[PDB]
Amino acid sequence: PMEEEEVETFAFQAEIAQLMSLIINTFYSNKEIFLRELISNSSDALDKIRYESLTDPSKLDSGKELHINLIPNKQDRTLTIVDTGIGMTKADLINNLGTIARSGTKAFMEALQAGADISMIGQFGVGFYSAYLVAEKVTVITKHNDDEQYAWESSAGGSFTVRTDTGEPMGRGTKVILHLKEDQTEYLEERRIKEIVKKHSQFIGYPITLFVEKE
Ligand SMILES: Nc1ncnc2c1ncn2[C@@H]1O[C@H](COP(=O)(O)OP(=O)(O)O)[C@@H](O)[C@H]1O
Numbered sequence: 001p002m003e004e005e006e007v008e009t010f011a012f013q014a015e016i017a018q019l020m021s022l023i024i025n026t027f028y029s030n031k032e033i034f035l036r037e038l039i040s041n042s043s044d045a046l047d048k049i050r051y052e053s054l055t056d057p058s059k060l061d062s063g064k065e066l067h068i069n070l071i072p073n074k075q076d077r078t079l080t081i082v083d084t085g086i087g088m089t090k091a092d093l094i095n096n097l098g099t100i101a102r103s104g105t106k107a108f109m110e111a112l113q114a115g116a117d118i119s120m121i122g123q124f125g126v127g128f129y130s131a132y133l134v135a136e137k138v139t140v141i142t143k144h145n146d147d148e149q150y151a152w153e154s155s156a157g158g159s160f161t162v163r164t165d166t167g168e169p170m171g172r173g174t175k176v177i178l179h180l181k182e183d184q185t186e187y188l189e190e191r192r193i194k195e196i197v198k199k200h201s202q203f204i205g206y207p208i209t210l211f212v213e214k215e
């Protein structure tokens, strides 16, 4: 019997859409900082569930281990960053990943126009959008204790979608799936991933593991 799935399409807030266009259509060196930004997000989400669990230990029923996994896939050209952090409810996903204005967005675009390094993006409260330095499409799968599993996705161009995820269940957390641009396949290489984790993400307070498919 044919399955039926609901999709909701949302417009990015106008300056977030302008920032995404600037990130995609301008050459930047130092693109590797995308991974620092996504690991930082995971670390923040791990902190949240860790503290929430102090008030309410049953919040870890959906899984006690607090960690980050990095999964390059050379066959489908994706790099996935998975955490067991707090996750996002549907409302969190729509509000925090594109609809609500970020106070730093205009300042950051001015800084970039004046020649700032793209590394400065996290300081402006818009670090997630660094994924578009290396990815043509991003899919975020997330599960929060309060709610069902959802999938957010965008290829930029001004819009994103949200749907209930019918894929593999996660117990709790977020997976960011980067569909890499053709010229950015270095970020599937185990040596390159280890290099940029060591350079930029050395003080994060949860274990990170890199899973490499046997060649
Ligand atoms: N791995 C994650 N788990 C939970 N929420 C996340 C994740 N990544 C991003 N988010 C949500 O998206 C928001 C935007 O992230 P970002 O653009 O990096 O800004 P910032 O980290 O400065 O808030 C975060 O504040 C958070 O609410």
Ligand SMILES: [Mg+2]
Pocket: 037, 040, 041, 122, 126, 127, 128
């Ligand atoms: Mg961030």
